[PDB]
Amino acid sequence: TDKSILEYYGLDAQKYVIYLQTLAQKWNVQYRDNFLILEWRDGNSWISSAIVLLQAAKIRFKGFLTEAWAKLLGGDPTDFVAWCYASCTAKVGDFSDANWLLANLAEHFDADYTNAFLKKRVSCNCGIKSYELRGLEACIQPVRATNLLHFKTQYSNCPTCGANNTDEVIEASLPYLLLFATDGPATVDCDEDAVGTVVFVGSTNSGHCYTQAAGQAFDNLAKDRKFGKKSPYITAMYTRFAFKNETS
């Protein structure tokens, strides 16, 4: 079929079927404080987590998702959530990955990808390499644990000289910073500067997630989940992240 449909929705054919399927869904919602929360059902929470996250980070969308996100916040998550499932080739009922979903959605954030940058420096026995990341790549950042301590200095091995190397963030200017865990949940303190986080509990093959923001936990299933500064985080998000360095 047509591709000014497949390209206006940002989905290939297979995913567009799933999208159409999921448009039949009705997602009940309620407010808790200033956050719109989807009622839990059918392995919902990876959808819910991302939605609370986006609200905490005051995110807006461009394209089709602009009005889909507006409709959700006005009380009708159908169009937005449908795209969410479709983007991850998932059917309602499926358990899945909030960071996968967030990376899909981030492509369509109404955000300053034009001017976003990270300046970095890697040191090894080869010498010292300075380099720069820009746009969306600069904003979405894999880390071992989701706080700035694990972001600003990362370590690996250099395949050329064989030495342990050190990759550090020297300067940053980003509309948002999205940290996501590379090896499943890792328990650390969150930064006070993080406007929101996602906590994952249980098996990574059969778990449950929820979002923390404004000193509260927003688990769309467990309504009495307790906020915890130190939690098994898979995600942390910062708004207008800016930093310029020093190291001596």
Add this chain to the structure above:
Amino acid sequence: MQIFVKTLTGKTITLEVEPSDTIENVKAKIQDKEGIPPDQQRLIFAGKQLEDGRTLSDYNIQKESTLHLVLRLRGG
């Protein structure tokens, strides 16, 4: 051609690939060196999630690119 992968724990490994290689091919190559099941793998290039049916070419992935291997989560 050669690309780099940052593994679950941030190790740097090297893969030999071609632009025509599918994401599944790459996951299989990763499993060879790292012992991680394909269905436990999420591969990222420059912030973008890489999908099983597609090729390195489809994503404009060139030599000496770095991909990020991430543990896939399944929660509900």
